Design a protein around this ligand. Structure first.
Ligand SMILES: OC[C@H]1O[C@H](O)[C@H](O)[C@@H](O)[C@@H]1O
Ligand SMILES: [Br-]
Ligand SMILES: [Br-]
Ligand SMILES: [Br-]
Ligand SMILES: [Br-]
Length: 715
């Protein structure tokens, strides 16, 4: 009743103020948000008891200013592992915990809505923001997102799933027209958002920068209204990506309730003030008051539940120590062991020769709106020191000295905030020979960073190893292998890189991604086996970039794309590699363990409305560990073309001791089995195959069931 009451009290002008942000806080002419560093604020209306609501990034943790002027207090937040690493956990419960921790910091720092999680599909590994997205698969993505949203919103604050939809490249994102069939949309790109919307009920959705089939997402009625609302039954409000679109009136008409951050003229001289443009449109009858009321109601019906609406006295003192444990745990389960030829874990007291500048310049996460400002960030070297591991102390000082020297130099000093990539081959061929005799093992850090606004390139030093990185690995490998010793590589990266050319040169490979503030601790602990790797890939690692099915990336013309066509359609990520027989370097769902697991006791039953899959996993190794199991369904060929198989469920065991087992029981609604034929979802009659895998290509148990009667669903 409150909402309809406030609504009835508002004047036309106050209503317009409410659907437009107050401008980017603390930049240009604008005052700081009462939470300094926050991404945006709504217009207050004291008249009718509406406060300003505060919105802030981001996916890796709350992003606000750590300090404030005329203030002795401190406002640090927890920097969690990046989303691609969180997805690697394949652990819903854990993602929910990460949401709660973040949510407590959101609430207690006076924020009302967290601008997370990001959940665009990994269409192409070069997308600059892949690090802060979950997966190339909509079920993994949707399920991780749902868990995170539930976590955040258990804390009395709102989540915001973004970016809706098909924002799968950074190049010309604010302008590019994304051409995608309705089938690709419904099966791949819309699909994760559908799951999140239906299962977790996020307070808000952020419409994407890009056009979708001719229309800006922020101004796309089919997207924000027919699909989101009418079909899916979304009950929240939609906000625009910052400065997205070109027409505030079209945005409101489309179902984009909240225009952020407001004052677009401050960034684009050709935009009018949106309040003035809207007021004029109302005056002229270009926009009806009824549409305006709907947008305002969508906003209030959600935000009357925000802490700010009840004048919540936030503490400015969240439990950072408790949240750090959660960040460490998330990182611990998200590391992916890609290769282990009797190399890991390291023996106790093993003397480590630590290589690569990334050991010191460790990447905690990518740049942009999804960045964070934690009190600390434990480098790989620091974590190893902290845990008291036996490392070459002379070498570590050499690296420290070399980085200082290089970063002080003109060519490599941080510019404007990028740090030029350092040469990694500064050690002499004889210096490394000395290292091989002195130490027991080699550990080489390979680091990459990416971020909002920039796409990566299929070139050396980016997707490919730079020549100096290749030379370092070759030399270290040769030297240490001659001495009978093992070499380990740590991939401190945010998205796939080439691995085929060098992986056979080394014995161990740990994909440690970018693990936030606790990175070095997580990494050290994985090396010694205190952590048993349980992460599995949420995205495909291709042998070569030319293998990638999304070849049109980043569009036409390449250097200034006005449009990009998803030629590969539904056949993206593993759906492509499986269906057309292209072998990846490492497949979707792949990941090793320090122990072994045996799958057994498969039972499959379909009562016509629910597919029930049960099996048993036993730890047959000598170290406790968790196992991620994946259930792929292979639908019959029947009427329409379909991928080879599709992930429909997944699970992760508790921490099993040697000899322990766990019974897995998963249920899949019949509707989930459907393919979209362009008009409707269809679950074709026929024999289906259940494929329970330790990865999409390591199937451990197979069974079948039959659909007797075709089922159809209109969107
Ligand atoms: O920082 C506010 C927003 O700015 C941009 O729209 C980013 O794409 C979005 O992810 C972020 O939440
Ligand atoms: Br997407
Ligand atoms: Br391998
Ligand atoms: Br990266
Ligand atoms: Br194209």
């Amino acid at each position: 009743e409150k909402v309809n009451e406030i609504l009835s009290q508002l004047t036309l002008e106050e209503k317009v103020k409410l659907v437009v942000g107050v401008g980017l806080p603390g930049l240009f002419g604008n005052p700081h948000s009462r939470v300094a560093g926050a991404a945006g604020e709504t217009h207050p209306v004291p008249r009718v008891g509406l406060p300003a609501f505060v919105l802030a990034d981001g996916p890796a943790g709350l992003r606000i200013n750590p300090t404030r002027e005329n203030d002795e207090n401190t406002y640090y937040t927890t920097a969690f592992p990046v989303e691609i690493m969180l997805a690697s956990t394949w652990n819903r419960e854990l993602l929910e915990e990460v949401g709660k921790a973040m949510g407590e910091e959101v609430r207690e720092y006076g924020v009302d809505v967290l601008l997370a999680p990001a959940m665009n599909i990994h269409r192409n590994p070069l997308c600059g923001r892949n690090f802060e997205y979950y997966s190339e698969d909509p079920v993994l993505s949707g399920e991780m997102a749902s868990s995170f949203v539930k976590g955040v919103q258990s804390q009395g604050v709102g989540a915001c799933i973004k970016h809706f939809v098909a924002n799968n490249q950074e190049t010309n994102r604010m302008v590019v027209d994304t051409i995608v069939s309705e089938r690709a949309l419904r099966e791949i790109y819309l699909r994760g958002f559908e799951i999140a919307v239906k299962k977790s009920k996020p307070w808000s959705v952020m419409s994407a920068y890009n056009k979708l089939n001719g229309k800006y997402c922020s101004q796309n009625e089919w997207l924000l209204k027919k699909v989101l609302r009418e079909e899916w039954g979304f009950e929240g409000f939609v906000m625009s990506a910052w400065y997205a679109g070109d027409n505030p009136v079209e945005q409101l008409k489309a179902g984009n309730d909240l225009i952020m951050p407001g004052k677009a003229y401050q960034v684009n001289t050709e935009r009018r003030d949106e309040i003035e443009e809207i007021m004029e449109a109302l005056k002229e009858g270009k926009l009806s008051e009824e549409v305006l009321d709907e947008c305002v109601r969508n906003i209030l019906k959600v935000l009357v539940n925000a802490p700010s609406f009840k004048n919540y006295r936030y503490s400015n003192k969240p439990d950072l120590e408790k949240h750090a444990k959660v960040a460490y745990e998330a990182g611990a389960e998200g590391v992916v062991l890609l290769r282990n030829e009797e190399a890991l874990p390291l023996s106790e007291n093993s003397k480590i020769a630590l290589f690569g500048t990334g050991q010191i310049e460790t990447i905690k996460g990518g740049t942009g709106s999804g960045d964070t400002h934690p009190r600390y960030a434990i480098s790989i070297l620091e974590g190893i020191k902290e845990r008291g591991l036996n490392f070459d102390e002379e070498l570590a000082k050499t690296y420290e000295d070399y980085i200082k020297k290089m970063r002080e130099t003109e060519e490599y000093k941080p510019r404007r905030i990028i740090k030029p990539k350092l040469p990694e081959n500064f050690l002499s061929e004889k210096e490394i020979h000395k290292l091989a005799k002195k130490n027991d093992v080699a550990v080489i850090v390979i680091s990459r960073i990416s971020g909002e606004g920039y796409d990566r390139k299929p070139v050396k030093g980016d997707f490919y190893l730079s020549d100096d990185e290749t030379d370092l690995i070759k030399t270290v490998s040769r030297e240490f292998h001659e001495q009978g010793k093992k070499v380990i590589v740590l991939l401190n990266i945010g998205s796939p890189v080439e691995v085929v050319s060098w992986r056979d040169l080394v014995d161990g490979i740990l994909l440690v991604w970018q693990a936030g503030q606790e990175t070095g601790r997580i990494v050290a602990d994985v090396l010694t086996g205190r952590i048993n790797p349980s992460g599995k890939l949420p995205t495909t690692f291709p042998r070569d970039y030319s293998d990638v099915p999304s070849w049109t990336f980043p569009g036409e013309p390449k250097d200034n794309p006005q449009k990009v066509v998803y030629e590969e359609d539904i056949y993206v990520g593993y759906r492509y590699y499986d269906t057309f027989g292209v072998e990846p370097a490492y497949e979707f769902g792949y990941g090793l363990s320090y122990t072994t697991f045996e799958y057994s006791d498969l039972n499959v039953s379909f009562d016509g409305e629910t597919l029930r899959v049960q099996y048993r996993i036993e730890n047959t190794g000598g170290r406790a560990g968790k196992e991620v199991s994946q259930v792929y369904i292979k639908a019959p060929k029947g009427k329409i073309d379909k991928p080879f198989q599709e992930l429909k469920a997944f699970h992760k065991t508790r921490l099993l001791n040697p000899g322990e087992s766990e019974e897995v029981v998963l249920e899949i609604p019949v509707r989930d089995l459907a393919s979209f034929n362009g008009e409707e979802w269809v679950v074709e009659a026929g024999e289906y195959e259940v494929r329970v895998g330790a990865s999409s290509r390591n199937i451990k148990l197979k069974g079948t069931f039959s659909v007797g009667e075709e089922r159809r669903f209109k969107p």
